[PDB]
């Protein structure tokens, strides 16, 4: 068992420190490494230090800048964070990667990073209103475009779940704000649009900002 | 410095193939090369623990190979849960360095095509801005074309897209691409469409979204 | 785990005289009303045995390292529990085994082990008095144990851990001889009402225990409990009370006793 | 205790228990039909019930069924090179049974380790529980695990499926340690009946003769084990049952 | 009744390798185990007695060990001569019992794959009956598969075979077998032919033996 926490959001040249508990095995005895990912990207290699904690290594992104440390008395690896960078906007995973001898690989969970001088704010909300515009037979989108809020997740969906049929959601745009943003619809029928009320349930839940809000279909 | 090539960057293929996917390391580094699956943003399984030896317990139609420079992950037959990431990476020296990953993406090949097409909402109107979006949904490829009207020029670079993934039970994607506009833009402009241009149908598809023009 | 303590004043060696005390049956041999001869390791009578003590009236606590020799007279006289045991061994610092024999205030325990010892070492009862008593809360014996090739403990016990007033009541002696490869321990106790001195009067020291240790025995060091509480300086060299006790040790000698064994085969005196 | 303790050693690690002051009943070992293994150097299990020893050390650890082999005087391999080695004039017991009803796991188990891999053989006796990464070759791989550079420990992989040679099994080495001290462990001494009344040899205890025994009027002091007379001569004992 | 397990059934080996073999027993037996070797139409030489005492004479390279159990014979470094069958026996009590003896058969162990096949001759066919000679050669791995094509049918249970001893100097076994039919079943069917599946080659073989049909 790996758990990896301290990850957060905060701005470029800041510092963060990550950390990550080892369970279940015996940490002390093995090099163990942080990788990263950012969001979309492969894997990238961080560092690694040696069963002991004698010697440290690093990847140049995060050369001289990080620091990879152990405490093999309290089973845990850590990761200081300096001079921040939009290079670093990645999930960290704390593992035992293998290398050529039988043994077992552990990787943790992975705690979340983002780098951007934006604040936490709640989702601009812009259903999809399908009208003479777009409407065409068992085809309409509803939906919302949603915008503006810093940490990753808005929750959307349609007519408080009642209108899950057809519903699709797509990954996320970082505008120049660093403010993240997201599209997610349901595809109905014409003919239903004078049927249901049509709501788009957004919540950005790192916000706590319900803003569940009434969908206009046949308007215009 | 040592780096990953993995030669197919994504793949499509269905339930039962046998499949293969190769990294190519830009130097030579004997069998010291690991390979594993990774479902989007969980821990990276490790596969393999070099060139050729599988993992305690990773499930037995897996396997690795090679050399020097050249080396494969293969699945004896592929299963739906194989619909993943594949990452080749070396061991040989420092830095630990990993491929480009190889995303199986396409959760069963088939053709099922599809396409919608939807304005600037009204109910994005009050935004200060137009934000159109074109919506080919529940299409099989990733691959479509998008195009725009706005004012009856094909806007270019003041645009994003984001796509949902081969759906499990349909095997088809969904697309979402946007024009996006100031309020003095939308007001300035005044015919609108956007068309999408999904090559499983045999044409453009488009819609008079006319922004304050309807 | 060690303290060096400080407070303790000097005074010259005291001595008293045996009386007689400190036969003991050097065989496991039934004889009724016969007069015996036996050579061995005996303290020879009217002897002057080295008197040690703890009281504070001045600010006297007294446990110094001592030779063995050839074998060990002991005897403490006391109202409290304040002499606990002993250390016997050789260099006393692990770079030899060396045997320990404590009542901690609990369980009687005896190990034998590299001890690395304390230069001073003891025990100590705090007087808790949000628990309303003494209770044993400072056994300072050795730093470490660093190989071990013995061990016991007795089955669980309590004892009083007294504030006792009045003049000495039990009489405890003890004879120690390390011998083959075995440790052989005699004892007696007696109840007394004698105010200090070593009492006059006659009594055998039955065997007690005898322990399979290959150990070369050349000094050893007594073990006694400080008081400590709230009423003292509290500090760890010096915030402790002495409480009130004596012990006397002779050592035994080759001699040849004539030993007279009554109807039911005690001794019941004897003649150096 | 040793035979039966729920989980053993990885045989780098390999425990170590020393026994002392007790009664070894070594045929009640020998005689439990358990053993794959039994085998003794220097002595014979029925004439242990005879001896006596300062100390007997019992060592214990898991490894492979067909590395059983290797535990043994003279014996070379991995097991014997880097993980535990006898003497080539020891004087003690193997013993190991097949374990894997315990010791594999469904999903294999690794819990259990070897050393792959050292710089040179143990002495006897002997234990390496370092896991610094061994260079196999020429650079020094200063605590990272690469190229020439391995973790020196590896796992066994017990499936319950094995062929029988890569199972596990456990096992228990015997040494028996007679120094210059008292002999605390010897084998268990056989009484017979009394017989009071009748002209008999006997031997209470160490003490001989031959005499009629019979219940006696007088009562020594608990610890006082015979009488004499005044001649010296042994007029009454204790019978220690 | 005291059963005897010998583990590998038959070994591969060459000159300078260490070999063991292995031999398990039912019961406990304490020590008493011989070990003997065979060669082919030879009387049994004995080896190890007890179960660890070289017998007089035998060279210092054989070794045994085991008390219990689990017994095993060792080689410390093979040679030309040690190529033989290997039985272990229980000297503890009545009846005596041998183990099912290991054939270390693979003097200088190869790879060379090898097949050929033949008809049913018409030197044959005089007898009133059709014999096929099924005839792989030369071919290093013992292990090998047959069928049959008898009016292209595959012929079953109708078949026998043998192998000559493994070749001193190629270490490659030849194979004989034969499919054996009547007068009435050798005119009735017209199209034949041995198919030798040999593992040592990518592909069966097989070959128009056409009894009455050339
Ligand atoms: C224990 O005894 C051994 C053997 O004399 C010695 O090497 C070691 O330093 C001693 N101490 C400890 C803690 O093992
Ligand atoms: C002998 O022992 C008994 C029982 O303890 C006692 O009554 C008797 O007085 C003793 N006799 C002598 C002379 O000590
Ligand atoms: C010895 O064992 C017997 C049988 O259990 C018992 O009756 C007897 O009291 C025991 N005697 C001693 C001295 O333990």
Redesign the interface.
Known sequence: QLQESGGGLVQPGGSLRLSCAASGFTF????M?W?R?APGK????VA?I???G??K????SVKGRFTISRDNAKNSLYLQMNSLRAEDTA?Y?C?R?????????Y????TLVTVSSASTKGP?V?????????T?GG?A?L?C?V?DYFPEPVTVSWNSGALTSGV??????LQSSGLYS??S?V?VPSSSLGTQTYICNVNHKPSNTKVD????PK?? | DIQLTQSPSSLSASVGHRVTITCRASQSISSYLNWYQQKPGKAPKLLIYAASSLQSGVPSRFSGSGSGTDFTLTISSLQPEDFATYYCQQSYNLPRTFGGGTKLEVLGTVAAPSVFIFPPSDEQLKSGTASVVCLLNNFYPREAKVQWKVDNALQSGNSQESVTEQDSKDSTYSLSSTLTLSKADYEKHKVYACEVTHQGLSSPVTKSFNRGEC | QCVNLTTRTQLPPAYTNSFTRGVYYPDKVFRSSVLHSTQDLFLPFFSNVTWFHAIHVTKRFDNPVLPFNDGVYFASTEKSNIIRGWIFGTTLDSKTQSLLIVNNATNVVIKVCEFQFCNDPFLGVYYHKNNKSWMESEFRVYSSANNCTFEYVSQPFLMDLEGKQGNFKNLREFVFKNIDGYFKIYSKHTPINLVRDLPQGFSALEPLVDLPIGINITRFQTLLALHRSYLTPGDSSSGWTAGAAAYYVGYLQPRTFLLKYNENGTITDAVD | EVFNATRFASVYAWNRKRISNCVADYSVLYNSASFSTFKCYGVSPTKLNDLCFTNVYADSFVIRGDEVRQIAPGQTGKIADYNYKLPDDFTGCVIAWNSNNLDSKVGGNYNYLYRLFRKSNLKPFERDISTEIYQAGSTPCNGVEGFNCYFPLQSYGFQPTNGVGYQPYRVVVLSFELLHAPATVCGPKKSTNLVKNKCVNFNFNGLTGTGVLTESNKKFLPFQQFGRDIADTTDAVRDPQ
């Open positions: 002390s005895s093995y090099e490494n990788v990912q492969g894997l990238e290699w690694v040696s069963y002991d004698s010697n290594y690093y990847a140049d999930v995973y593992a990667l293998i290398t050529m001898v039988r043994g077992e690989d990787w943790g969970q992975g601009s812009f259903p999809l209103a399908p009208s003479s515009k777009s065409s085809t989108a939906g475009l915008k699709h959601t797509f990954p996320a745009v997201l599209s619809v595809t809000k009434k969908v206009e308007s215009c």
